[PDB]
């Protein structure tokens, strides 16, 4: 089997009248768990979770000099208000500012974007579509288990980019931390192509172990976005990963 199936986590999806998959990886024991082995291997558009490889590539090619470089707002008012201001790599990740990352992809270019995604072993490695939207409405597809594989390489500094690039991106992935755990992660909301889904991918660092996770769920409207982190934390608590 490889992966173990734990159907009891479906209770957390059903409790919120939702459908989806959570995948966990225990790094110390090299064991994986999921509520749905089939959906765990189903490949979707990455949407904003593609900000992780896009950040790595932009840094390594010097499109982004460091996490303090300011990317000026282009003056075009967009629907998410946090986008209509200047950003650096830290705040553009936090607020998931698409137009900044679309400019990164334009500067990287089709040829180099394709070779890096092949170097990364990322999903189906297919960038067909527009250079600045293929991860939103083009041909790239990645499963939850494939996100884990990619994230594990990032955690260990094993992707073929500089160690510094990988350290900066993991810094920008910082989402939450207390005296018990650190979460580094990235959210995604795929809306341009059916089915609309939400993503949350990353890992939980403990004193003696790290737990990688990748989840996606059906997201017909934006009012459910909070359930990405809420369902994931319910699974993490049930498995006694976080208190
Ligand atoms: C990437 O996944 C998304 C981009 C492609 O639009 C961004 C946008 C936010 S959600 C939009 C604000 N919702 C309000 N209700 C996002 C996310 O939260 O994952 N990623
Ligand atoms: Cl994006
Ligand atoms: Cl940090």
């Amino acid at each position: 089997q490889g992966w173990q199936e734990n159907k009891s986590w479906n209770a957390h999806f059903t409790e919120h009248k939702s459908q989806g998959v959570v995948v966990l990886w225990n790094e110390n024991k090299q064991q994986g768990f999921t509520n749905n082995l089939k959906r765990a291997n189903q490949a979707f558009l990455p949407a904003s979770t593609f900000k992780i490889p896009n950040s790595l590539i932009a840094l390594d090619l010097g499109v982004v000099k460091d996490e303090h470089q300011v990317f000026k707002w282009d003056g075009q008012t967009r629907d998410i208000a946090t986008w209509n201001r200047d950003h650096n790599l830290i705040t553009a990740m936090k607020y998931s500012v698409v137009p900044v990352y679309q400019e990164f992809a334009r500067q990287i270019g089709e040829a180099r974007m394709s070779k890096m995604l092949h170097a990364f072993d990322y999903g189906n490695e297919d960038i067909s579509g527009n250079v600045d939207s293929f991860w939103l409405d083009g041909g790239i597809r990645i499963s939850a288990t494939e996100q884990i594989s990619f994230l594990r390489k990032l955690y260990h500094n094993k992707l073929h980019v500089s160690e510094r690039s990988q350290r900066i991106v993991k810094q920008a992935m910082l989402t939450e931390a207390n005296g018990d755990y650190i979460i580094r992660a990235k959210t995604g909301y795929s809306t341009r192509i059916e089915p609309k889904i939400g993503w949350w991918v990353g890992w939980v660092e403990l004193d003696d172990n790290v737990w990688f996770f990748a989840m996606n769920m059906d997201m017909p409207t934006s009012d459910g976005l909070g359930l990405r982190q809420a369902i994931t934390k319910e699974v993490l608590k049930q498995e006694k990963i976080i208190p």
Side-chain angles (χ1 to χ4, degrees):
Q1 47 248 77
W3 302 75
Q4 322 249 37
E5 195 166 64
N6 188 339
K7 280 183 162 212
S8 67
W9 305 349
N10 285 335
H12 309 297
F13 283 103
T14 305
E15 180 88 7
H16 301 278
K17 323 194 172 112
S18 298
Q19 283 214 81
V21 64
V22 170
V23 185
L24 312 181
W25 184 262
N26 180 327
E27 182 64 9
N28 278 349
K29 290 73 131 196
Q30 293 287 293
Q31 295 172 353
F33 308 87
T34 182
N35 61 303
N36 182 346
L37 296 155
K38 295 162 186 324
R39 190 172 172 141
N41 291 295
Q42 181 181 355
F44 297 93
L45 275 155
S48 299
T49 68
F50 193 73
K51 290 200 173 74
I52 297 177
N54 203 359
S55 289
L56 288 164
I57 292 165
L59 276 155
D60 215 57
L61 297 182
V63 171
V64 172
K65 303 303 197 210
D66 59 44
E67 74 270 25
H68 301 294
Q69 186 179 358
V70 174
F71 311 107
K72 294 240 205 303
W73 174 42
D74 65 3
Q76 158 162 355
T77 298
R78 295 176 175 88
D79 275 347
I80 299 129
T82 55
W83 290 10
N84 303 319
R85 45 181 100 145
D86 297 350
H87 285 284
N88 59 39
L89 192 74
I90 302 296
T91 61
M93 282 267 290
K94 178 183 172 169
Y95 298 103
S96 209
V97 184
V98 166
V100 166
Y101 278 78
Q102 290 183 294
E103 179 63 38
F104 292 171
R106 287 194 282 268
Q107 297 191 22
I108 287 151
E110 269 169 33
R112 291 188 300 184
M113 183 79 80
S114 187
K115 299 145 135 183
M116 293 293 237
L117 290 191
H118 179 69
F120 288 173
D121 202 19
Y122 187 88
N124 67 350
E125 310 180 10
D126 181 340
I127 72 159
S128 60
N130 299 136
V131 62
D132 56 1
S133 74
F134 66 79
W135 66 94
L136 307 175
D137 47 24
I140 185 142
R141 303 286 183 281
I142 189 163
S143 77
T145 53
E146 283 160 9
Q147 299 259 29
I148 308 272
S149 187
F150 170 74
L151 291 160
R152 289 190 66 249
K153 296 174 186 112
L154 174 63
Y155 174 84
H156 290 297
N157 295 323
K158 287 297 191 182
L159 295 162
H160 194 198
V161 287
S162 67
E163 174 180 314
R164 170 186 179 272
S165 279
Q166 289 176 91
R167 288 190 179 271
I168 294 171
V169 170
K170 293 185 268 192
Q171 175 187 358
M173 280 167 67
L174 174 53
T175 298
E176 186 176 314
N178 68 357
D180 285 323
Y181 60 88
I182 301 147
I183 291 169
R184 311 189 181 272
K186 178 73 194 87
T187 51
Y189 184 18
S190 170
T191 62
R192 302 198 185 186
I193 300 296
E194 282 309 312
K196 300 184 181 54
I197 57 146
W199 277 106
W200 203 31
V201 301
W203 61 79
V204 179
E205 311 185 1
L206 306 177
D207 288 341
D208 39 354
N209 203 2
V210 47
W211 284 85
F212 297 82
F213 66 85
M215 81 87 66
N216 60 65
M217 64 184 288
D218 292 354
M219 191 68 54
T221 74
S222 59
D223 302 282
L225 290 175
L227 303 173
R228 297 171 298 178
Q229 300 96 331
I231 292 157
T232 301
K233 272 158 136 41
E234 287 158 0
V235 167
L236 294 168
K237 194 171 131 174
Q238 179 186 323
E239 302 304 312
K240 279 126 180 95
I241 298 168
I242 68 178

